[model samples]
Target chain A: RLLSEDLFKQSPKLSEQELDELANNLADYLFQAADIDWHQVISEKTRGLTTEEMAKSEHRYVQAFCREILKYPDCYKSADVASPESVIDVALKRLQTGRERLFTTTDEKGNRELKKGDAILESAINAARMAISTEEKNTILSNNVKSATFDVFCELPCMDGFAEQNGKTAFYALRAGFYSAFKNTDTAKQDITKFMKDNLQAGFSGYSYQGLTNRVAQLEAQ
Target chain B: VAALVVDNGSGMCKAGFAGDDAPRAVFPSIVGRPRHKDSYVGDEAQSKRGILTLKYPIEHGIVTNWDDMEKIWHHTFYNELRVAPEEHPVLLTEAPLNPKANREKMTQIMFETFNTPAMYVAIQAVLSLYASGRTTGIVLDSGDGVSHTVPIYEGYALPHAILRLDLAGRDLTDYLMKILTERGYSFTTTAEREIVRDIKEKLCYVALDFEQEMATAASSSSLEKSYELPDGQVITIGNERFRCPEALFQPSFLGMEACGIHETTYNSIMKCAAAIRKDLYANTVLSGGTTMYPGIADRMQKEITALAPSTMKIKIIAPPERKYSVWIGGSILASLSTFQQMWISKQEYDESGPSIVHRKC
Candidate 1:
């Protein structure tokens, strides 16, 4: 993809010329960051790599990607601009650096020794696989800051609930009432059951009641 | 004889004989007793806001000034409704978590001072539900002086779950005045402010898409509408229409930190038991004079749906009569043949004193 696409997605208000200049500037930062053989990477005739093969590979895939994108500057861009695809293609070049920061190991004599691994390349690939609204510092900074139209109570809550908790609601708040509802008899359990079905969970957000309860019971002695 | 019901609030006082379709008299909820002793009450007080000193019995939904309150109440009984209090039972409405002392004071005044035959104090949010007769819903009550979200379960107004936002109709009116003034339209006087209020009610509306409407408001005057002031001037209002109501959605719009109506509603329901949450969405009701702004219901439904669980069915009732729901509900309850037993009669008043209101209705 063109760096233009990346920059455009961030702010569509920019003109094509600004997009071009920003993409070029970004390519320049990345070019300095990669420290690769731009000449050989571009000039050498690389063997074909399949999409399936590329998924399992990043450093070379990124190398091959940047090389291909590097040609865009040679052709359409008139020799100086970095190709858009090279942004992702050139991406893995920073894997070792990013990975080195992530994991710090040790030597026998020493405090800590930081080392780089190939894992960060794939992590970026995965994160890239993973993941705004109105822009600007105020809009972007507080997009999740909770709208204040009135708390921007107009915007949704930041849910600690297993589902989409958009407001100031939290699962901690959820179970306080839940545990208290045990005060009831027949309907409480039924209500809890339906509530679990329709609500309540600890995903990455934290714990689902029924599943945890079942596993606990299953492991209990008869 | 029918009972007398008075919903004396910080913004407006509504009073009437029970069983009537509407309040017999509705007046501003203030007593104008400036530096001097010459006094004015209810509607009469509106003219003297110029006097640097006007007083409300209720401030931010709490009883703050009793003399001002009694002055207004006296006007309601003696002149506004022209009814003798001793001849009828009286039903009064109050905000949630009203101070027991205030309730006791109210009880004492109704029974001892006015000498009503009987008296009952009901929470405003709960009565709003009874106005049309359905329990298990959330009332998003926004009025002249204040607003709150109360999740009522089986006629019980959930006190712990009620979220009171210290903003309402008066703030919206002020916002309108300032914005219009920014456009060189001055409404500094009380009468002019009233005219501006009419301007707000007639021209102002909640925007379906605040961002889009705001954009359109600026790009061209396509969104502009003309409003004729009482004096011969015709003013063209462009953005302030939705801008005023947008404050309802964005207190930040007015530079106040609070949740919008939808978030406030969601926050209130979230505070309730999970079992009762679904029922609340299905019966979310709108009350208060501020809530009558056109398209406010649509704006609320759209915003809350985005915030609520997709599986739940969201229904909000923003009826034209919601502004009077409190008074109307009092009317129906006090008119009930069986309700006479519910009142704290003069007999019970003498026996247990004003504190009895805490126990009985």
Candidate 2:
């Protein structure tokens, strides 16, 4: 639908001649309305605001309101404005792009949340500081960029669950408890489900109960 | 004995107790402190840890039988009301259709501990309607836990008419956290959580037509997109704006399946009998602490009005201090004799068993 000249002319102050003038000067009227005079109109109904500031504020509010209305598919069915829904989708897409950039560093693979819980435990075994402390790093391969990857937590045998050992929760707490015992101890530090595998998985010899315990006891070490 | 108003929050819950001009006791509902031993509660807890370290404990509107929750409630009440557990006739508020086991457990704790002779378990939304003197209206509660809509008819309630969308202020904060996290700016574990909330409350307005408004905001003209935060950050972050898009109408924007407010409201209205739809149109009341935002009523009016047939005259009015509507409704209930009659008392708690608790109605 076209911009309704009739609607603009309906205002009390605009006589037929004025309406004609308004139509002839449509861009001018809209520009004026869209401009700073919005402040005076807004100030009349409120307080503690300079007329200039109020008008500018209202202008922003209207622009923002109009922008959102542009997001609905048929939002401006009565007008020729771009279908509002498409506009919203575009805006949302742009917003995500703009806001997400401020924090990202490193490649997409590195972007994954700090090494998984099990990985963190494995890192502890191969920790640079630990390896350097007792000649563990030099003996294993101090020259290796990522050496000492294991042999640190050899004392932590009777795994008492990751969430229990440390305050941090497991990488996948949804599967079961803190750590599974039956999951291949070899893969304990490598797998995402290590916590559940180390604590709850079976084959503790004396402590088997549910189907989970039975199933866990049957799995060979990874 | 004072009318104890128990809730699932840390600060003193709002709403005046019986006979007083205002609420009698305000207590925190938090059960556990932060993971960090040094973490203090109240303003300090908020200031240090970006999240509530104390567990909200109530999960999916049901209280998990965590002992820490019980301990927290006892400690919170003891500090706020200054009454021994034996002295108060508590007015405990529970969610609508709060789980039966949870109810029994809550009672077990209260009866076993404070010996609450008369504990009135009422729905906070219902009490809010009563306090506000709204005989019949639908309430949309946008609180800390969840944003839900309840349609109140007369003194009674149409429980089926109630619609709860899992989206709430907390989810909005999480979205902000993720948005910032993705942007290389982590809001989680930072004071920025409150900052985002304040900004959202101050600058955010419901986009009546999400598509148009989003397009306008997305325009590269630089005329529409702009904002400056308290930390001297003047960033024009409009295109990826998250909360208004997801929580307002589509929480799926965050990968959740919950329906948006628009769908929730429509579902609630449709639940009513065909004849009562008109009555609802005339008395559409927006409730909940979250509706206090500036443009919600206008946006809701525009959306709900269009969804209804043209003959259905719709009037959406935001009640005074919209955030306090529920508590206000609770106050009104306390004052009204007719409404008070519907309230179950300490004697009722003792006389009626849990299975027939609804019999008091």
Candidate 3:
């Protein structure tokens, strides 16, 4: 978890009262008869903002997301949601309302019925994969952070944010592929592994963000 | 002294009238097959009799089969109140857009077979509007398979303003099930149904910044998580887990070319009330079963909060989202001496046939 220390620290502060109210409000917002927005945020069509911009989401949004993830007790009794890993799991379920059946069919006595109105079904599955893959990669990479950082084998900012960006890219790519194979969403965006590898390679080749001797030694090692 | 309102929904309709403590809600919305037709299986159809095969004749609130529906309705009817059809005014509830042919068939079954003198063939949607006090409110009936919206004004429903786009709890569940299946998770019918309903009712919410929420949820390490299905399979997703509710914020995700609830509701509001059109202000109330969820009022407030022209105000009724408003409204009408005169009687039905079915309306 050391690898994610700085990144985690970057999260904005939430007051105790704010956090409590957010939790309660989100619990109610989500648990109640809330509205729906069928459009999802795909990287290709992502609103085009730097990482800094995305961090400014409302406290309610955070709480709502937490709630969706952390569902009620006996959550497994319901399939659409994943059981919560913790009490603060307010993550929204990635399902769509007013979803229509695509195809039609007839019953035993020739009674016609909607066959496949699974339009947003793909988005939900893809979202799940994306969420899982990112979290998985984070947990795994953060596990060996103390040993790596203590031995001074890690760069400063890169260890703090850059490594995670690449790591996330890798995770995102893996998850995106998994999502595609599952036919989760109609559109696929980003290559997590490729994005990190290429960008890291480009940034490192510039011979920037390092002492000349260290850069030469690093180059020599490579 | 005691009356039972039975619906062909989950279980025996309901037993005991208004003042009863706990009404027996029984009789699942099912019809046994031909072989078990005559066997007098009561409310708990599954446990009472060994009737395995079942059929749901009422699709989207229409009588799927005259013979089958007549038989099942009678069995359920007799189980509730043992009164002869001729004595009591059986308040039969049906869908709003119930076809005339279906009504005629229902009338035939009730009058001919049951020897009933009078049957109040009323639309449940209209009744709900009457029950909710707001004369100017939208009755959005999100039940079974369709999300139907009817605009009511001054105790009348505007048929033209009624908007239905064919999405409901079942459709949402069906979509979720497909996604789960794609993820290699087995979505058994019963389990899937329960999960889908819960997600819609409990987990899902109408997010204003859907894309932002999706991105944040996607980005949050703590948000995206895994869930175990009934068959002991794990499926993980991002923090913005309830994508169904997110659709209210982002309609494009579903690949549908329609304005989300914000637009539809605003349009409905404009269509329903003309007084607010020129004045740029009005009172709004959300009347539907879907509104009963916990945090929905606050979320809905956010959605339509900016709808007005800066000078107007928008607020949901303080309490009793789905039923309270309508029930109170209906009770108010019931309380008024003049309102009692508005009710259509058996004599009215006999005199004008079904043409004046909306007389009391």
Candidate 4:
């Protein structure tokens, strides 16, 4: 976990109050909703940020989970660990051998149905792989955070200031394949990941803020 | 006076009194009648008795079977909430661009039959935005039957700019069933759809890149996923995770003429006055169940950015509980002490008849 450091980043900040609400709302989800891919949920939201930002996210994101990951008595039903190594291997074994059915469910008609163990294994591997690869790659020795940073535009931002550019600014693409402008809105430069989230975030009005905070919490729980 | 708010989604019906955080009772919109048993509505309808016969009243957001709808609504008051309809004002969420006569008919029934003291017919998109506390913005709502991109400005929806697509959650569910069936795994029971839907929710996701994921969607190594059923059968689903949601971006997946959501979003905004497009793009709000897919919001931000006016900044306001936005809005509107004035009172209904609904609502 320490292979990566100094991952500079700039993105929306969730207050402690917001973080707690997220934990409460998400406790019901992280263990129950979609099979837990604890870290992929974090990476997908802030992909494309620099190593420095990635480093900051590591510390910031983990705090929210720390509480409910332990506070709930049955939290151990699903472990609160730093890694998914044991979980992934267990699911892989179950998928291949078809041995464990202790956690299985039956059809609504009370008929016995086949378990999709294959789904569980692949999903764990995928989500675990994403969280692992994303975090691991963004690290110093194996650095590989170059995917989402690339231009999704491969067609395509001033928020708040004006609906249309005021003659002095024009929209142009950075070599990275994202939208940017000089005098179109702000002269300061913000990278795509942070810029996109921030720009996307700027569209939120009062109620938008309420929902976005809720959304941020939800994404974290995922 | 307390008010009743019912959000009749194409698939589920959520009902409760005003000012509640969540709906009191939520159930399937289907009404089931068994050959030898009593007909029932909502949750009890699917008792799964002997030879169950199920009928869906609302199709693609329109009430095709009015009698079935009556049963569902009747059940909500008498059985679900246990309240007399005449004691409270009522608000029933409606689909966008509804037929003029549907509202009139609903109003007629509410006052004459149910004896609702007051009523208001509200557009679903508007209710969602209001639920999120916005009067103006773009509401991208997708439910079982319909996918809509409606642009709102200062509380009023732009009729011309509103885009409706036939593709929705139900289509994706069917697509999963289709691909699975073709692989020789055919599920013919009603309960199977539930299993398939569970699979869709638990395993499916939208990919970041359509073409790239399509190419590499091979082998059990990268994309292949296994979901164990009750016994021991493992269902293998691969590219389908990314492929199905891709239908929203490329309708060719369904071989339908409906335009993709982003294009629909752009055109929907373009249809509005040229100046409002930027603000609309900046305030895109997500509503309905389908919008909950992972990467859905990012996909919209990515796709819409590619097509929008070069300088336009797009914002996608997506909440985790987006599926409940419409009902929340209905609850909020119903709870509003001042909004009581907005309802069409029985006195007005008596004075001008059911036609008066068109004017008040």
Q: TM-score for every candidate vs. truth?
A: 0.60, 0.54, 0.50, 0.60
Best by TM-score: 1
The C-alpha local distance difference test score for the whole of candidate 3 amounts to 0.44
Chain B TM, cand. 2 = 0.80
True contacts kept of each: 0.00, 0.00, 0.00, 0.00
Encode model 2's per-residue lDDT on B1-361: one tens digit a residue. Answer: 4455554532224534555545554443343343215324334444445334554445445454335456655555665555665666556666666655455556656765667655556676676666555667666666766666777788566888887776776676667667655546546654566677665655555665667766776566442345577778765455345334346677777788877686688789799888777766777666655666566677777777667787777877676666655555555444455644655555655665443344543
Q: Compared with the true structure, what per-residue lDDT tens digits does model 1 show for residues B1-361?
A: 8789898777888999888979989888877754314678866677667663565567777765555666777788999988888998889989887766677778877876789888999988888888857888999888887898999999888888999888888888888998997788888766677788888878899998988988898899998999888778899989889989999888997988888989999999999999989999999999988899888999998999999999999998877799899999999988988887899989998888777899996
DockQ of 2: 0.01
- Assign candidate 3 its CAPRI class: incorrect
> DockQ of all candidates, in order?
0.00, 0.01, 0.01, 0.01
Q: Chain A TM-score of model 2 versus the true structure?
A: 0.14
- Model 2, runs deviating above 4 Å: A1-222, B7-16, B19-29, B34-53, B180-184, B190-195, B215-246, B337-356
Stretches of candidate 4 off by over 4 Å are A1-222, B36-38, B182-184, B188-190, B219-224, B228-233
Q: Which stretches of candidate 3 lie over 4 Å from their true place?
A: A1-222, B1-28, B34-54, B80-86, B115-117, B181-184, B188-191, B198-202, B219-241, B248-252, B276-283, B305-307, B318-361
TM-score of 2: 0.54
Task: Write model 2 residue lDDT over A18-132, tens digit each, in one string.
Answer: 5344333432222122212222222232345432343344444323323322322231133456466833233233434442111111222211111112222222222212212
What overall lDDT, based on C-alpha atoms, would model 1 receive against the true structure? 0.67
Q: How close is candidate 3 to the true structure, as a TM-score?
A: 0.50
The Cα RMSD of model 4 versus the native structure comes to 28.0
Which TM-score value belongs to model 4?
Answer: 0.60
Whole-model lDDT values for every prediction:
0.67, 0.49, 0.44, 0.65
